[PDB]
Amino acid sequence: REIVHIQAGQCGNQIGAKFWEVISDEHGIDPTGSYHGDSDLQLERINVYYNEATGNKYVPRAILVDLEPGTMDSVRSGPFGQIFRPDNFVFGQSGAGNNWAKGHYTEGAELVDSVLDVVRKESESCDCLQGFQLTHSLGGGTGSGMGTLLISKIREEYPDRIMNTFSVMPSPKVSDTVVEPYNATLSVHQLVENTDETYCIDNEALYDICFRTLKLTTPTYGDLNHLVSATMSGVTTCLRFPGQLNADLRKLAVNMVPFPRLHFFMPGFAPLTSRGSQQYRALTVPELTQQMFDSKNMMAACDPRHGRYLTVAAIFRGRMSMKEVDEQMLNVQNKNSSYFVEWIPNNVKTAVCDIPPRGLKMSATFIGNSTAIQELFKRISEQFTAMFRRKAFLHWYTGEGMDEMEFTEAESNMNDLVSEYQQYQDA
Amino acid sequence: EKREHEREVIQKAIEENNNFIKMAKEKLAQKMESNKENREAHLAAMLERLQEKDKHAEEVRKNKELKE
Numbered sequence: 443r444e445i446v447h448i449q450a451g452q453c454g455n456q457i458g459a460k461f462w463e464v465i466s467d468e469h470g471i472d473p474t475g476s477y478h479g480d481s482d483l484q485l486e487r488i489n490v491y492y493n494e495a496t497g498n499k500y501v502p503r504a505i506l507v508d509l510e511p512g513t514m515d516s517v518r519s520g521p522f523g524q525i526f527r528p529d530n531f532v533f534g535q536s537g538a539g540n541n542w543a544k545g546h547y548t549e550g551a552e553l554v555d556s557v558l559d560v561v562r563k564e565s566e567s568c569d570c571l572q573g574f575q576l577t578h579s580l581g582g583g584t585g586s587g588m589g590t591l592l593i594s595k596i597r598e599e600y601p602d603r604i605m606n607t608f609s610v611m612p613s614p615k616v617s618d619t620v621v622e623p624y625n626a627t628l629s630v631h632q633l634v635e636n637t638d639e640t641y642c643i644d645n646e647a648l649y650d651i652c653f654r655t656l657k658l659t660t661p662t663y664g665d666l667n668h669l670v671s672a673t674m675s676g677v678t679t680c681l682r683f684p685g686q687l688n689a690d691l692r693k694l695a696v697n698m699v700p701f702p703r704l705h706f707f708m709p710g711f712a713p714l715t716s717r718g719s720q721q722y723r724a725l726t727v728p729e730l731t732q733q734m735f736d737s738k739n740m741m742a743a744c745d746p747r748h749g750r751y752l753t754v755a756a757i758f759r760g761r762m763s764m765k766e767v768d769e770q771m772l773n774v775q776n777k778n779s780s781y782f783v784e785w786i787p788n789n790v791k792t793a794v795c796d797i798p799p800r801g802l803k804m805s806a807t808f809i810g811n812s813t814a815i816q817e818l819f820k821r822i823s824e825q826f827t828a829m830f831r832r833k834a835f836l837h838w839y840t841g842e843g844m845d846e847m848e849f850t851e852a853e854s855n856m857n858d859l860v861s862e863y864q865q866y867q868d869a
Numbered sequence: 870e871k872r873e874h875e876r877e878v879i880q881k882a883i884e885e886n887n888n889f890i891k892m893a894k895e896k897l898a899q900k901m902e903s904n905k906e907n908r909e910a911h912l913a914a915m916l917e918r919l920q921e922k923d924k925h926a927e928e929v930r931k932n933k934e935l936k937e
């Protein structure tokens with residue numbers, strides 16, 4: 443069951459690149475593609491993410507896409523840059539100028555077919571293709587506008603494969619330009635329709651976690667992206683490693699998504715760590731469990747106590763008692779049973795994998811489908827209409843073909859989405 | 870339907886980039902043409918009266934020949 447990875451634009455390629463570093467280290471694959479690991483657990487499911495090349499080398503099933511040659515050249519120059527199959531670098535030259543319209547309708551249109559061709563070559567190699575996972579941000583133009591255009595086209599060619607994204611939410615605390623709320627509202631409309639699973643990586647939550655909890659006074663994208671690679675390794679654990687679960691994207695979607703549009707997950711991680719500095723006490727299973735449910739460990743700036751958990755998946759990494767995991771997990775439910783819906787019995791599921799991630803002896807990754815994610819979609823809807831009620835900055839988009847109407851629809855679909863999350867917070 | 874829309878938006882951005890080069894090109898030619906006529910019309914007015922001055926210097930000299 444192969445997965446096809448796609449990373450698009452400045453942000454999607456920078457986090458895209460860290461993911462492949464991180465998990466290439468966990469599977470003992472080095473920057474040349476040669477395996478040098480200890481456990482067989484590292485290669486039993488290597489094919490989910492890697493293609494096996496002649497000479498028994500491993501090549502990520504990764505398609506790298508940008509409207510600009512900038513970041514993508516930095517990937518090729520990066521530590522694992524040589525691991526990526528070079529034919530899979532697809533890129534224009536004009537850039538997308540942080541403009542959703544250029545990504546989706548003008549500039550991205552030129553380039554999308556060439557991306558769809560590399561996607562096709564990869565899919566055909568595939569034995570049983572589960573689907574796709576995309577890394578992008580919603581606040582610029584390539585990953586946001588072109589990214590969702592790809593997602594639309596992939597779903598037309600492969601209507602019955604799973605579509606998974608890692609979508610970075612914009613935030614005034616980490617913002618390139620003032621049109622990010624416009625770009626993200628337009629994308630969120632796309633995502634509600636055309637993905638099975640999206641992980642809401644909020645840059646607001648990454649920022650606070652960097653500032654308040656890691657005490658980083660002035661956090662770079664590299665600090666934010668350390669958090670993003672930790673969560674990304676986490677949520678993909680039960681797909682890359684052998685365990686009792688041995689999950690795939692579809693079973694994941696079936697059990698997490700009770701209603702098709704409510705497929706926006708809050709990720710969470712524990713222990714929160716800051717790059718380089720390693721602390722030396724491992725956590726106790728009770729600590730992982732309290733921290734991982736802690737709002738301070740959520741990667742989407744939502745208060746879980748303001749919503750109800752529709753469903754929950756939790757993944758524990760390291761040598762530890764599955765008895766104490768069972769006990770610590772049963773205890774946080776029955777302590778805070780108010781915050782889980784009664785009408786999906788037994789909606790918290792847990793898995794364990796022996797291999798911990800690099801640097802830590804024990805770790806807990808949290809995947810929550812909480813109705814409190816509406817707080818995110820409200821935050822962005824507020825910034826959206828704060829400008830749109832004055833039609834501010836709109837010309838950047840009417841200049842590339844778009845109509846005011848298209849904004850009213852996207853705005854409207856998102857307010858609908860927030861109403862839908864609100865319906866089940868009372869049910 | 871979505872692709873029908875996707876090509877209508879890029880057709881609009883072209884339509885409008887074009888209508889804008891058009892109306893500029895035309896606004897220019899209109900201005901450059903109304904300007905040659907105006908400036909000429911003015912230089913013509915100046916001469917017509919500088920020459921009506923020459924006709925009056927004929928009439929004046931032809932009067933002193935009605936002296937002799």
Ligand SMILES: Nc1nc2c(ncn2[C@@H]2O[C@H](COP(=O)(O)OP(=O)(O)O)[C@@H](O)[C@H]2O)c(=O)[nH]1
Binds near residue numbers: 456586645670
């Ligand atoms: N967490 C994180 N966010 C990023 C990074 N780079 C860009 N962003 C966010 O993405 C938005 C800009 O979109 P970007 O991907 O750079 O534009 P694009 O190249 O056209 O896709 C901004 O709001 C940033 O906050 C990164 O490395 N890490």
Ligand SMILES: COc1ccc2c(c1)NC(=O)CN2c1nc(Cl)nc2ccc(F)cc12
Binds near residue numbers: 689690691698756792
């Ligand atoms: C809430 O009920 C379920 C939630 C999630 C899942 C599931 C049932 N059953 C399945 O087969 C797929 N699966 C999971 N999928 C993936 Cl990719 N990672 C996981 C990590 C931890 C975990 F506890 C479950 C999963």
Ligand SMILES: [Mg+2]
Binds near residue numbers: 582618
């Ligand atoms: Mg940028």
